[PDB]
Design an enzyme around this catalytic site. Structure first.
Site, PDB file in Angstrom:
ATOM      1  N   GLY B  20       0.723  -1.407  -0.063  1.00 13.99           N
ATOM      2  CA  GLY B  20       0.049  -0.106  -0.137  1.00 13.99           C
ATOM      3  C   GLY B  20       0.915   1.230  -0.029  1.00 13.99           C
ATOM      4  N   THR B  22       0.842   5.735  -0.319  1.00 12.35           N
ATOM      5  CA  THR B  22       0.356   6.995   0.416  1.00 12.35           C
ATOM      6  C   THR B  22      -1.112   6.810   0.540  1.00 12.35           C
ATOM      7  OG1 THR B  22       0.816   8.134  -1.715  1.00 12.35           O
ATOM      8  CG2 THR B  22       1.743   8.813   0.470  1.00 12.35           C
ATOM      9  N   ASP B 132       6.116  11.877 -12.482  1.00 14.30           N
ATOM     10  CA  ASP B 132       6.506  11.207 -11.212  1.00 14.30           C
ATOM     11  C   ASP B 132       7.405  10.229 -11.688  1.00 14.30           C
ATOM     12  OD1 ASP B 132       6.729  10.728  -8.551  1.00 14.30           O
ATOM     13  OD2 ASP B 132       5.011   9.690  -8.181  1.00 14.30           O
TER      14      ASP B 132
HETATM   15  C1  LIG Z   1       2.448   0.377  -8.914  1.00 21.27           C
HETATM   16  C2  LIG Z   1       1.336  -0.519  -8.804  1.00 21.27           C
HETATM   17  C3  LIG Z   1      -0.014   0.213  -8.508  1.00 21.27           C
HETATM   18  N1  LIG Z   1       0.808  -1.153 -10.112  1.00 21.27           N
HETATM   19  N2  LIG Z   1       0.355  -0.728 -11.130  1.00 21.27           N
HETATM   20  C4  LIG Z   1       0.352  -1.803 -12.163  1.00 21.27           C
HETATM   21  C5  LIG Z   1       1.071  -2.757 -11.793  1.00 21.27           C
HETATM   22  C6  LIG Z   1       1.192  -4.150 -12.383  1.00 21.27           C
HETATM   23  N3  LIG Z   1       1.941  -4.935 -11.314  1.00 21.27           N
HETATM   24  C7  LIG Z   1       2.436  -4.755 -10.388  1.00 21.27           C
HETATM   25  N4  LIG Z   1       3.244  -5.690  -9.582  1.00 21.27           N
HETATM   26  C8  LIG Z   1       3.721  -5.917  -8.430  1.00 21.27           C
HETATM   27  C9  LIG Z   1       4.638  -6.843  -8.149  1.00 21.27           C
HETATM   28  C10 LIG Z   1       5.188  -7.100  -7.008  1.00 21.27           C
HETATM   29  C11 LIG Z   1       6.132  -8.106  -6.670  1.00 21.27           C
HETATM   30  C12 LIG Z   1       5.319  -9.358  -6.211  1.00 21.27           C
HETATM   31  C13 LIG Z   1       6.539 -10.007  -5.116  1.00 21.27           C
HETATM   32  N5  LIG Z   1       7.137  -8.798  -4.501  1.00 21.27           N
HETATM   33  C14 LIG Z   1       7.212  -7.611  -5.596  1.00 21.27           C
HETATM   34  N6  LIG Z   1       4.963  -6.156  -5.964  1.00 21.27           N
HETATM   35  C15 LIG Z   1       4.185  -5.271  -6.327  1.00 21.27           C
HETATM   36  N7  LIG Z   1       3.820  -4.203  -5.039  1.00 21.27           N
HETATM   37  C16 LIG Z   1       4.850  -3.922  -4.308  1.00 21.27           C
HETATM   38  C17 LIG Z   1       4.645  -2.615  -3.731  1.00 21.27           C
HETATM   39  C18 LIG Z   1       3.216  -2.228  -4.479  1.00 21.27           C
HETATM   40  F1  LIG Z   1       3.180  -0.769  -4.704  1.00 21.27           F
HETATM   41  F2  LIG Z   1       2.256  -2.712  -3.638  1.00 21.27           F
HETATM   42  C19 LIG Z   1       3.216  -2.919  -5.803  1.00 21.27           C
HETATM   43  N8  LIG Z   1       3.322  -4.855  -7.452  1.00 21.27           N
HETATM   44  C20 LIG Z   1       2.118  -3.359  -9.758  1.00 21.27           C
HETATM   45  C21 LIG Z   1       1.252  -2.310 -10.372  1.00 21.27           C
END
Ligand SMILES: CC(C)n1ncc2cnc(Nc3cc([C@@H]4CCNC4)nc(N4CCC(F)(F)C4)n3)cc21
Ligand SMILES: CC(C)n1ncc2cnc(Nc3cc([C@@H]4CCNC4)nc(N4CCC(F)(F)C4)n3)cc21
EC number: 2.7.11.1
Lengths: 282, 282
Positions: B20, B22, B132
């Site tokens: 999560g 901000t 950003d």
């Molecule tokens: C930026 C977010 C809104 N966003 N937008 C499009 C999108 C597409 N794919 C992901 N995928 C992933 C993969 C992983 C990997 C799994 C194992 N650890 C890293 N972690 C995360 N999160 C780590 C911290 C977060 F901001 F919550 C996200 N997102 C995130 C995406």
């Protein structure tokens, strides 16, 4: 620059909680030694906020010797809480007041405007900008006198930026600090405030904030007006018209506005606010 | 403009909580019908936020057909929660990655930069600005491909302004919307990002944000550099130097930067990120 690393409870006795804004609570307090009453604006802090970045803003508020600017007495930092100590105004803000009394008369509004202008002319002469003129930030004490609430401190402890500072280009950093503001933007805010006092709301109060800002950028934007034409003098309407000049190049300065009929007319005094305060008691 | 007033649980099955920011949480989810995996960015809302003010930003993100821009699939509003649904990138952000793998090599950084530039050139051709650019907003999928995370939506649901919107002058409203930005500010952010990837931090990361911005306004400000000179090629250093051009008038455009030696050199491909991902598994 006299920020005391002490517990303000050594110097002051907390009495009651006046309320709390976006950040922090405000307390009514009494000075142990002088017995005088003060206002203490408290703001909670993290191990992330640096205090020395505030020292320029506190210099601003400290070196302000004017009757229409609320008086600053010192700051206190203790256990990650910041306390700003100021002269106490018993009646609170015009907003605290009109929420009970209903709309202000043209005479009361005129006197408030004059007093606010006097403080602004001073501020702009010291090349400072209030940035947040509005009814909630105009204080009334029990003598019916008018004080501009604190400025430049509240908006810097805005952990919110359209972007991330360390990655910001210089031109972006500059705009994120100044806000593109200029002194004459206070004059616009005063005009909106005069409507607010007259109508209990600023214009477009029932409309989403973002939409309001959008609309102000459209080619043919039209500045707001007093809703009820017949209720107010020609002088009042003109005061609104010229303070709400769209182009900041043609907008009158504080000292210029002080020469305006509406605020230079005779008979403007604190007695006007005194029966406003009497109305509060009814 | 296809914002569904449905429960996204009708179309998607939530699997796990990625984290999560901000505001809001991010979930990994699976499409019921296609079986494909998506990312769902959830954002909590009040009865104060208006959705129609977002429709222009969602148009921006929807009408973006580029390989280096993360793919948008739709939005869902249900019980005061907003869901943005996007193509899922398995490895997450470069920041999720380098926090385990340590610094990136010059070749990996070069390939990322090229890919980011390709997405920026596209965005700026559609007269849009990311605002950003940073490691946390550059996504990597399991094929080692590079995707710019969503933009223009996160920073408008910034209930924080230096002032109060209804009382804001038009010139203030304009700056509070645009942020004084221009497309070339993305190019600066890219340069800082390249350092971030090289050094695990942006420059001045250990310094209070406000102070960093202050410093960028001083007459003789000096743009940041790569800390270790010997570690990087002359081409890399020059890439840093020209992306971090102080004046936005002399700063190269995305398409111009695409002609740079560092990003136009042969042998740049997703294989570079693939062994970066292999490193993650070690
Ligand atoms: C930026 C977010 C809104 N966003 N937008 C499009 C999108 C597409 N794919 C992901 N995928 C992933 C993969 C992983 C990997 C799994 C194992 N650890 C890293 N972690 C995360 N999160 C780590 C911290 C977060 F901001 F919550 C996200 N997102 C995130 C995406
Ligand atoms: C703006 C604040 C930081 N500030 N700064 C200087 C200062 C000097 N005097 C007051 N005095 C008062 C009086 C009253 C009156 C008592 C009976 N009701 C109104 N209420 C309030 N509070 C209502 C809601 C608030 F913002 F918490 C304040 N403040 C407040 C002051």
């Amino acid at each position: 620059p006299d920020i005391f690393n002490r517990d303000p409870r050594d110097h002051y006795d907390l009495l009651q909680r006046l309320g709390g804004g976006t950040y922090g609570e405000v307390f009514k307090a009494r000075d142990k030694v002088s017995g005088d009453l003060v206002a203490l604006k408290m703001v909670k802090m993290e191990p992330d906020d640096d205090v020395s970045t505030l020292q320029k803003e506190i210099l601003i508020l400290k070196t302000c010797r004017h009757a229409n600017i609320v008086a600053y007495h010192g700051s206190y930092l203790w256990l990650q809480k910041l306390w700003i100590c100021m002269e106490f105004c018993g009646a609170g803000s015009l907003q605290d007041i009109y929420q009970v009394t209903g709309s202000l008369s043209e005479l009361q509004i005129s006197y408030v405007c004059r007093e606010v202008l006097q403080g602004l002319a001073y501020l702009h002469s010291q090349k400072k900008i209030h940035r947040d003129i509005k009814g909630a930030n105009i204080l009334i004490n029990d003598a019916g006198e008018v004080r501009l609430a604190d400025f430049g401190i509240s908006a810097q402890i805005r952990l919110a930026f359209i972007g991330t500072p360390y990655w910001m280009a210089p031109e972006v950093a500059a705009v994120a600090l100044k806000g593109g503001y200029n002194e004459l933007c206070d004059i616009w805010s005063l005009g909106i405030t005069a409507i607010e006092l007259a109508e209990l709301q600023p214009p477009l109060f029932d409309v989403h904030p973002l939409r309001v800002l959008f609309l102000m950028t459209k080619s043919g934007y039209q500045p707001p007006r007093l809703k009820e034409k017949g209720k107010w003098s020609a002088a009042f309407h003109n005061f609104i018209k010229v303070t709400l000049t769209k182009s900041p190049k043609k907008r009158p300065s504080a000292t210029k506005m002080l020469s305006h009929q509406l605020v230079s007319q005779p008979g403007l005094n604190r007695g006007l606010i005194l029966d406003l305060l009497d109305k509060l008691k009814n």
